[PDB]
């Protein structure tokens, strides 16, 4: 796409948010828009926002999760799984991206990688409700 002042942010290591002096309160408000539109099923708008937020701050786990959730909902399962892999590297001990990756892998016709995602969840997550679903998917996969 268009604006590659994104290439400068990359090699130099900064975020575009910092490069452009965007207030935290501004980012938070775009986040709230992104969150509300998403919960409201207004997926086209929410995607515009989450995309902006991910472009302006590629290191924000919550932005990466939002955009990956949108791609999951839109059945862009490869893009969702690629973003979940990034969100996992960032948050590096939340297993929610690993669980949702298992869901994506299943839709990408890769039940074995889906199974290892879910196993990874059970093996390491401390989240009970997440483990419960992981364990259900694991039981259902034969």
């Amino acid at each position: 796409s268009i604006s590659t002042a994104v290439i400068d942010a990359i090699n130099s290591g900064a975020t575009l948010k910092d490069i452009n002096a965007i207030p935290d309160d501004m980012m938070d408000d775009i986040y709230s828009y992104a969150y509300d539109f998403y919960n409201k099923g207004r997926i086209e708008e929410a995607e515009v926002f989450f995309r902006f937020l991910c472009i302006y701050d590629f290191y924000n786990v919550d932005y990466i999760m939002g955009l990956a959730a949108i791609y999951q909902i839109k059945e862009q399962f490869q893009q969702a799984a690629d973003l979940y892999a990034v969100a996992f590297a960032l948050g590096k001990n939340d297993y929610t991206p690993v669980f949702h990756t298992g869901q994506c892998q299943l839709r990408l016709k890769a039940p074995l990688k889906a199974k290892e995602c879910f196993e990874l969840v059970i093996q390491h997550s401390n989240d009970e409700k997440l483990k419960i679903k992981a364990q259900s998917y694991l039981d259902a996969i034969q």
Binding site: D28, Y31, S32, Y35, Y38, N39, D62, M65, G66, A68, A69, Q72, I73, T96, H100, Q103, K133
Partner: peptide
């Protein structure tokens, strides 16, 4: 309340 709809971190309250 759907498992195929991820649940996102609520905006800092």
């Amino acid at each position: 309340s759907n498992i195929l709809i991820p649940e996102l971190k609520a905006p800092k309250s």
